[PDB]
PDB file of C-alpha atoms and ligand atoms in Angstrom:
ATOM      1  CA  UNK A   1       0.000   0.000   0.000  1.00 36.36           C
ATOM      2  CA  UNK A   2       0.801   3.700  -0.911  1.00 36.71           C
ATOM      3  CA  UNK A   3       1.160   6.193   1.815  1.00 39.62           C
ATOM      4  CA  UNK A   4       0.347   8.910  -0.455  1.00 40.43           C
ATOM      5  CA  UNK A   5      -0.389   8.356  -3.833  1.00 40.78           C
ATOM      6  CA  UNK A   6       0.481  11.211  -6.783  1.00 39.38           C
ATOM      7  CA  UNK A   7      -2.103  10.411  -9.607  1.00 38.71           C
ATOM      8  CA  UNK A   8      -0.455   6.993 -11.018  1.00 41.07           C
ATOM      9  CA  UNK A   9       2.978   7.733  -8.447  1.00 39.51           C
ATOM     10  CA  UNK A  10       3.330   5.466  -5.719  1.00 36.40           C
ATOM     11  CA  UNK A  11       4.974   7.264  -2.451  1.00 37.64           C
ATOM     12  CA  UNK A  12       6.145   5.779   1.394  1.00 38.62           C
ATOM     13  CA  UNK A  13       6.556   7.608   4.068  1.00 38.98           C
ATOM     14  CA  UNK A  14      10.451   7.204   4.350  1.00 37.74           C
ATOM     15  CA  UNK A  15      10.456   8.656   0.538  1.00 38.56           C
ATOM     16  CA  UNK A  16       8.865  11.815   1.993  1.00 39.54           C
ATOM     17  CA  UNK A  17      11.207  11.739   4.955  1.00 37.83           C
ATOM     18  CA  UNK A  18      14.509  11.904   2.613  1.00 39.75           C
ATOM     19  CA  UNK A  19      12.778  14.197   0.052  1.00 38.33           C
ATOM     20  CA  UNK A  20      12.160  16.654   3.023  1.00 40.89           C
ATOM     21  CA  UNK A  21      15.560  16.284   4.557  1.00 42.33           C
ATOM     22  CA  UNK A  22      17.048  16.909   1.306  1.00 41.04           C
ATOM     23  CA  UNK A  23      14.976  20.296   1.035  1.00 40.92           C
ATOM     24  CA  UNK A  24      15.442  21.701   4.342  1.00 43.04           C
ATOM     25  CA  UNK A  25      19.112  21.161   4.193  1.00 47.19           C
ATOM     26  CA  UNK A  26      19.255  23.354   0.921  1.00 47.87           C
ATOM     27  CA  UNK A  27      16.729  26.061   2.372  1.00 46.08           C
ATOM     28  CA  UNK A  28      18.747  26.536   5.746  1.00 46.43           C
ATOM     29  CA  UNK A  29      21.885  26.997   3.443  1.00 45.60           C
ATOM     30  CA  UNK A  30      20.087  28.973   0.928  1.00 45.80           C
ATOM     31  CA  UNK A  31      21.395  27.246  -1.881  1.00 49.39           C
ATOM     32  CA  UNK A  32      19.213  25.918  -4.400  1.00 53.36           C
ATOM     33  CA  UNK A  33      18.914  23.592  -7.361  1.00 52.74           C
ATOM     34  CA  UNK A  34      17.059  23.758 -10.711  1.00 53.62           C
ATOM     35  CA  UNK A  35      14.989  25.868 -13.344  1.00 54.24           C
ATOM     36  CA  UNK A  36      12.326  26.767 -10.947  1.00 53.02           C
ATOM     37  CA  UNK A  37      14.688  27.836  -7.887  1.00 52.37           C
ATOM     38  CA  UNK A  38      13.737  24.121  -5.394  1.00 51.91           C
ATOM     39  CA  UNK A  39      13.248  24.924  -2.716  1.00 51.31           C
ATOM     40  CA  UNK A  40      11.077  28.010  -3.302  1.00 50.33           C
ATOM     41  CA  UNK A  41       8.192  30.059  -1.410  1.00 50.82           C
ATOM     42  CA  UNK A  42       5.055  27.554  -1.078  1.00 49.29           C
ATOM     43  CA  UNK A  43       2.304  30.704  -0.961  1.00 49.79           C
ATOM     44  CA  UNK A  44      -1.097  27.830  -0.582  1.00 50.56           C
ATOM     45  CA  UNK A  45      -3.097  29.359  -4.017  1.00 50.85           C
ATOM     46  CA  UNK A  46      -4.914  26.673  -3.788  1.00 50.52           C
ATOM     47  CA  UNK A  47      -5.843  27.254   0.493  1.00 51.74           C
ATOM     48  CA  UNK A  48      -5.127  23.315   1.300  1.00 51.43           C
ATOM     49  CA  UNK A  49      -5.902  22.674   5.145  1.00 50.60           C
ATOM     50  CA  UNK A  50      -2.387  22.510   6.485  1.00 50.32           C
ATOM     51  CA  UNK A  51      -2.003  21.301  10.532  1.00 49.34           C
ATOM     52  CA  UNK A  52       1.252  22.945  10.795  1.00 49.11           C
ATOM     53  CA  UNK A  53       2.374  26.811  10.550  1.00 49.69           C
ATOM     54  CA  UNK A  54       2.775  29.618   7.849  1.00 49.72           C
ATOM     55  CA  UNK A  55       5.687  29.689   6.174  1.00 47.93           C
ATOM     56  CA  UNK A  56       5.602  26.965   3.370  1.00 48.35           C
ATOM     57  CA  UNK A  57       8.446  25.483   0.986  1.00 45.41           C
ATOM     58  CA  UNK A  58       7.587  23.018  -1.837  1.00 44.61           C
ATOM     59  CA  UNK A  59      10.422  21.174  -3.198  1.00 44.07           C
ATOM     60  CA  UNK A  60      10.341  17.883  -6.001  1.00 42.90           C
ATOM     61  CA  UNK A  61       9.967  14.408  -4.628  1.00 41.07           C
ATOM     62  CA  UNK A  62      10.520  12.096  -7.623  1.00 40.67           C
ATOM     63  CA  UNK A  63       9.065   8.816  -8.635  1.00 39.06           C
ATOM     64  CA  UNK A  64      12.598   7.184  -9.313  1.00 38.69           C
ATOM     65  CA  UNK A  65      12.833   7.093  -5.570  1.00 37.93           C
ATOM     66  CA  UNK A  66      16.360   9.812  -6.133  1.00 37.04           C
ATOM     67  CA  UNK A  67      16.363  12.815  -4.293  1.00 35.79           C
ATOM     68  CA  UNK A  68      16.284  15.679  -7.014  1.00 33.90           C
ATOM     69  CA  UNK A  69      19.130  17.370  -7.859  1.00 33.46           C
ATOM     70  CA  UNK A  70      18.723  19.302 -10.911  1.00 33.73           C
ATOM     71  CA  UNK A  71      16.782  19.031 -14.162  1.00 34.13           C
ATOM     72  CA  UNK A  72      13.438  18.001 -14.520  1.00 36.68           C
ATOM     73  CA  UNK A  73      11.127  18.165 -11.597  1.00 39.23           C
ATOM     74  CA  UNK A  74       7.968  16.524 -12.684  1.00 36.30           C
ATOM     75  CA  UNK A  75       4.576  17.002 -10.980  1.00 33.32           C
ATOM     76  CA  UNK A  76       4.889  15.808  -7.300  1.00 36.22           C
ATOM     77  CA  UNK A  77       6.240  17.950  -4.193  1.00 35.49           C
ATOM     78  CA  UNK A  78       6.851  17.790  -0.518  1.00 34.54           C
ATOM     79  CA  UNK A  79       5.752  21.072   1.471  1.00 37.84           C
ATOM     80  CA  UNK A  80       7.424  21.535   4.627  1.00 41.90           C
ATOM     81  CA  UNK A  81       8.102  24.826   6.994  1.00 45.72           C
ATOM     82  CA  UNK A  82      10.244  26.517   8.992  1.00 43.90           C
ATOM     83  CA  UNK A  83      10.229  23.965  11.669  1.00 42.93           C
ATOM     84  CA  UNK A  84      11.224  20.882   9.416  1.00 44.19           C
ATOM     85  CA  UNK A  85       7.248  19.905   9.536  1.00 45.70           C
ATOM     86  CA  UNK A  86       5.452  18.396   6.743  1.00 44.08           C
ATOM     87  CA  UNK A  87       2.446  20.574   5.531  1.00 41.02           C
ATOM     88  CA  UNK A  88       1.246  17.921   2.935  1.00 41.45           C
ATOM     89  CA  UNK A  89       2.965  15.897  -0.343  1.00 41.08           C
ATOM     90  CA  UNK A  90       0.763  17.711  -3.065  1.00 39.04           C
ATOM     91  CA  UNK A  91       0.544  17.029  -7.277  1.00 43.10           C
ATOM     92  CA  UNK A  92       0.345  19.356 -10.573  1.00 41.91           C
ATOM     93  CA  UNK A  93      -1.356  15.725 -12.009  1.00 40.17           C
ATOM     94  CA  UNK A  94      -5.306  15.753 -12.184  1.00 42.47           C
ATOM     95  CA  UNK A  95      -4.793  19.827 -12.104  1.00 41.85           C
ATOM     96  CA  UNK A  96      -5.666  22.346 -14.559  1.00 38.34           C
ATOM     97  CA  UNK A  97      -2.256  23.685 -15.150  1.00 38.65           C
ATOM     98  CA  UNK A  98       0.060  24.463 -12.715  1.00 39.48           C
ATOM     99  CA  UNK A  99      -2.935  24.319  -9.830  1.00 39.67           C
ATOM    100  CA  UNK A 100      -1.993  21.744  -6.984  1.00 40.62           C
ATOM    101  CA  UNK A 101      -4.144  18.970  -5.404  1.00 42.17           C
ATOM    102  CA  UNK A 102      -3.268  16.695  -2.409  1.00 41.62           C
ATOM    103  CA  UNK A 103      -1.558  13.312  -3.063  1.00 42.09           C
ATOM    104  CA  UNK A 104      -4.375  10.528  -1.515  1.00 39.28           C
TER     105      UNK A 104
HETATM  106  N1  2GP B 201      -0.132  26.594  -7.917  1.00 40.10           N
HETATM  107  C1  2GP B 201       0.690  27.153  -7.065  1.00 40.10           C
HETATM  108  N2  2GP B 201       1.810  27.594  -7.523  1.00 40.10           N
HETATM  109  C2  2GP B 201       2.610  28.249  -6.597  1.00 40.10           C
HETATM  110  C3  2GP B 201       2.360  28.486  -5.293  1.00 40.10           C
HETATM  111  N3  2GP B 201       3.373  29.188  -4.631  1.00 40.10           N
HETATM  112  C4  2GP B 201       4.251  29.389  -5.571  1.00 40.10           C
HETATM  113  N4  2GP B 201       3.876  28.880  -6.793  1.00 40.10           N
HETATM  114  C5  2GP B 201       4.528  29.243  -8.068  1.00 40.10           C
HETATM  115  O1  2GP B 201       3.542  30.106  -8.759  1.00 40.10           O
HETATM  116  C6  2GP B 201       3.607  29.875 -10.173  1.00 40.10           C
HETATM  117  C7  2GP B 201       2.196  29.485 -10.808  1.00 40.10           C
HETATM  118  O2  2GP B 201       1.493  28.379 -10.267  1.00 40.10           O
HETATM  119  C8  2GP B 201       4.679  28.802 -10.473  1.00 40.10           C
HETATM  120  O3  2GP B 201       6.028  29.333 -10.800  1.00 40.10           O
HETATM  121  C9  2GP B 201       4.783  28.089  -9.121  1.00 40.10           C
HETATM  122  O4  2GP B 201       5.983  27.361  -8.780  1.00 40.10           O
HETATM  123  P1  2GP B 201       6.120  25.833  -9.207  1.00 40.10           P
HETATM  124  O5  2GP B 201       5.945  25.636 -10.650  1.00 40.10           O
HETATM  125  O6  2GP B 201       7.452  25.537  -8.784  1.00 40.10           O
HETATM  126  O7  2GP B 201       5.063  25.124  -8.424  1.00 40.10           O
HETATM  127  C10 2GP B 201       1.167  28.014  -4.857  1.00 40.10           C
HETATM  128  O8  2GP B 201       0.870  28.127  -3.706  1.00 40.10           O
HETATM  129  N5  2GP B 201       0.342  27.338  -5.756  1.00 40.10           N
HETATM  130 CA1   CA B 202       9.751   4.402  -2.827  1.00 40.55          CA
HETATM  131 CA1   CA B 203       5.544  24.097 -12.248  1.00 41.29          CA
END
């Protein structure tokens, strides 16, 4: 069984874990990696139901089970704040264009 599943992407929760640790240590350095700036400024568009506090980072967790390091990001993310808390693991797939729903 999926912990949270990304349209036809399968996810655990240890692949969230590493994805997350992976983005935190790049935000506390302020480095990052990519086209699109990862990890960037998570605003909630969308206005998702998130337990944990304002402010939000969404950075690539990929299907290949690598953490992402450059290149192509495809549709899934992690959000996590400012305390190393995951907000939710959201999905640009079964969205009208670059709109976000929550991975299941
Ligand atoms: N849909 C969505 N995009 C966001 C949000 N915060 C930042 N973005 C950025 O706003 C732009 C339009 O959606 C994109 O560059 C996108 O970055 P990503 O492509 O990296 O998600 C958000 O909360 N929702
Ligand atoms: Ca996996
Ligand atoms: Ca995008």
């Amino acid at each position: 069984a999926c912990d949270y599943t990304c349209g036809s992407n399968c996810y655990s929760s240890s692949d969230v874990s590493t994805a997350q640790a992976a983005g935190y240590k790049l935000h506390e350095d302020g480095e990052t990696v990519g086209s699109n700036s990862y990890p960037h400024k998570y605003n909630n568009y969308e206005g998702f139901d998130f337990s944990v506090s304002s402010p939000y980072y969404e950075w690539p967790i990929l299907s290949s089970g690598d953490v992402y390091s450059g290149g192509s990001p495809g549709a899934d993310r992690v959000v996590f704040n400012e305390n190393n808390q995951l907000a939710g693991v959201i999905t640009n797939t079964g969205a009208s264009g670059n709109n976000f729903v929550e991975c299941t």
